[PDB]
Design a protein around this ligand. Structure first.
Ligand SMILES: Nc1nc2c(ncn2[C@@H]2O[C@H](COP(=O)(O)OP(=O)(O)O)[C@@H](O)[C@H]2O)c(=O)[nH]1
Lengths: 279, 363
């Protein structure tokens, strides 16, 4: 009783591969619900086969609920899949749950969504991975999404919607790792001082000159890595700290995620791969 | 010279694009003898690229990689189309690839004829959803791997695909066969002869006696070619690719300027407003170090000259960072001769910081 029409029906419901549908339906004696169950077990093994593939594309998503915001990375292999409605809906569902549940342990989020992830992988045929999640809490929160590839959350005090947005955009573009220059620990500043003194010394600068130049470099260093010490991207004649003071505001926190951060860019040589197969 | 056709493969990572391309090269070599791959049929020479990434393809297209004349959509018949198959086809529509041919791969692993037909009907429906002619699309039922393994049956299907490359993708129009156009670089006066404008003929041919329009920047003018020369030697005609001087009847040196084009009458118009696809160079590519915003006012370099323009960013986009690609609507401060497909540089202070293509002329 395994008609083309029955195969068609199971395929519309699951989006599963044609031949996978035929096989599941045949083993299920034509019971659609049982076939879907069968495909569920099969799917874990299909996904396991892909789990080793590098998944460095995908999306950053952000969502705010009052004094609580989540930022989330969900990866896939290609940006074609990153744009797909089904992948999008999965990432949105994960996001919604992380906000609703105030979930900051990515292994909890992973566990909750593993069955859905597997079904998605089995149908899309790319490794998909819920990679990381973080919360930011704050009096005022805002977000910025630079397409799907960069997301930012900012927490502030005394700042209106537009100012928070502009600071989030700045963070997206300029990637500070601290809020203020004085937040850089003394221990880190002293290590960076020695790095710069070694460099200055071997370039032939006399000790007394090198020391004074390096003191200057440390101010530049803690300015460059801190939000308030960076030139404001929309008006770089002023720092963000000056911007905040003009608005009687402050920033109490921020988080920036970028898709594929810390995952090595795999290079592809199409011509070579074709030549390899041409034996 | 044998006609040149640019093709590309698009499809799911696992569905055999690489195997197919290898099989095309192998079978065409065995049959007819002898980054990107190249192969020949008796009548055509093909340059073949892969399209693994949406942004990557758009960037390549913008920065100079010749646009596909046709795409091969590769779908394994075991699965049928994937959810992201619609994004593959949507890419095709977005860059305006003129034709798509489908290669249904792994048909050796599908026994049921009715199942192959279901897969085929799905692909046709997807194509038509994005206004490709799904009913008339060539769909080849093949097996890349078995053809590569020299199974006669499946080699024939590779030859079939090649036949459609040959028949279904029309011969791309050569520059020389296009209506005359010369981008003007310099303008000189010659007493007892008249005005001469120099440049490299981009398309077509200019002969003595023929009318031309002078298009862009200023109100269009018409003139007659009274001579063509190369290094001070008179030619009967100037041809696409040749650096020439065109002598013009009556029109005076002050009435013509760099950035204008000479063109066959009625074949190109000046415009000020257009939709474009743009790519902004990264810092490492020698571009901007910092983002720009809605008020960015660069120059748009069309053929031989800069024209200032303002920009309208897409809805929801407030910032453009080095390395981004985006769509933008551009309004120039004066008109410039242009058609859909024309490339341009984006410059500031005379330095190139990006590239674009005119997608759609508006006004
Ligand atoms: N069974 C079968 N598999 C094929 C055929 N053509 C390609 N493939 C599959 O295609 C896969 C690799 O080709 P491709 O889709 O370009 O993937 P990639 O090389 O891993 O990036 C292999 O795992 C093959 O199983 C075919 O005719 N038959």
């Amino acid at each position: 009783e395994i008609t083309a029409s029955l195969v068609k029906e199971l395929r519309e419901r699951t989006g599963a591969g044609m031949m996978d549908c035929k096989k599941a339906l045949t083993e299920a004696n034509g019971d659609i619900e049982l076939a879907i169950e069968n495909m569920r077990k099969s799917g874990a093994i299909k996904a396991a086969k892909k789990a080793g593939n590098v998944a460095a594309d995908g999306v950053i998503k952000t969502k705010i609920d009052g004094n609580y915001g989540i930022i989330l990375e969900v990866n896939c292999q290609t940006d074609f899949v990153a744009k797909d409605a089904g992948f999008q809906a999965f990432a949105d569902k994960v996001l919604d749950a992380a906000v609703a549940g105030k979930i900051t342990d990515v292994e909890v989020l992973k566990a909750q969504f593993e069955e859905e992830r597997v079904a998605l992988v089995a149908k899309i045929g790319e490794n998909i991975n819920i990679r990381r999640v973080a919360a930011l809490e704050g009096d005022v929160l805002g977000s910025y999404q630079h397409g799907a590839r960069i997301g930012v959350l900012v927490a502030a005090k005394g700042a209106d919607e537009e100012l928070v947005k502009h600071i989030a955009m700045h963070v997206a573009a300029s990637k500070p790792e601290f809020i203020k220059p004085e937040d850089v620990s003394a221990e880190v500043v002293e290590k960076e001082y020695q790095v710069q003194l070694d460099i200055a010394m071997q370039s032939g600068k006399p000790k007394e000159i090198a020391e004074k130049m390096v003191e200057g470099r440390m101010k530049k260093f803690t300015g460059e890595v801190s939000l308030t010490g960076q030139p404001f991207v929309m008006e770089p004649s002023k720092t963000v700290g000056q911007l905040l003071k003009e608005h009687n505001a402050e920033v109490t926190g921020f988080i920036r995620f970028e898709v594929g951060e810390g995952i090595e860019k795999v290079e592809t040589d199409f011509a070579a791969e074709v030549a390899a197969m041409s034996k | 010279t044998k006609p040149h056709v640019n093709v590309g493969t698009i499809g799911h990572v696992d569905h055999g694009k690489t195997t197919l391309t290898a099989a095309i090269t192998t079978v065409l070599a065995k049959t007819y003898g002898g980054s990107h791959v190249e192969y020949d049929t008796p009548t055509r020479h093909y340059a073949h690229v892969d399209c693994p990434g949406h942004a990557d393809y758009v960037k390549n297209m913008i920065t100079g990689a010749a646009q596909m004349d046709g795409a091969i959509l590769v779908v394994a018949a075991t699965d049928g189309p994937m959810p992201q198959t619609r994004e593959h086809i949507l890419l095709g529509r977005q860059v305006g690839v003129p034709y798509i041919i489908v290669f249904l791969n792994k048909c050796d692993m599908v026994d049921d004829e009715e199942l192959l037909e279901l897969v085929e009907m799905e692909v046709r429906e997807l194509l038509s959803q994005y206004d490709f002619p799904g009913d008339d699309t060539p769909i080849v039922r093949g097996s890349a791997l078995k053809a590569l393994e020299g199974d006669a049956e499946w080699e024939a299907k590779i030859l079939e695909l090649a036949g459609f490359l040959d028949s279904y993708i029309p011969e791309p129009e050569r520059a020389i066969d296009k209506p005359f156009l010369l981008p003007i670089e310099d303008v000189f006066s010659i007493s007892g002869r008249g005005t001469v404008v120099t440049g490299r003929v981009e398309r077509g041919i200019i002969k003595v006696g023929e009318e031309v329009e002078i298009v862009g920047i200023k109100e269009t003018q018409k003139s007659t070619c009274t001579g063509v020369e190369m290094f001070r030697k008179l030619l009967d005609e100037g041809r696409a690719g040749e650096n020439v001087g065109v002598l013009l009847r009556g029109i005076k040196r002050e009435e013509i300027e760099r950035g204008q084009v000479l063109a066959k009458p009625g074949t190109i118009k000046p415009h000020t407003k257009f939709e474009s696809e743009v790519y902004i160079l990264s810092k490492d590519e020698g571009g901007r170090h910092t983002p720009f915003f809605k008020g960015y006012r660069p120059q748009f370099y069309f053929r031989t000259t800069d024209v200032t323009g303002t920009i309208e960013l897409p809805e929801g986009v407030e910032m453009v960072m080095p390395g981004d690609n985006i769509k933008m609507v551009v309004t120039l401060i004066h008109p410039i001769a242009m058609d859909d497909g024309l490339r341009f540089a984006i410059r500031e202070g005379g330095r190139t910081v990006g590239a674009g293509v005119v997608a759609k002329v508006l006004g």
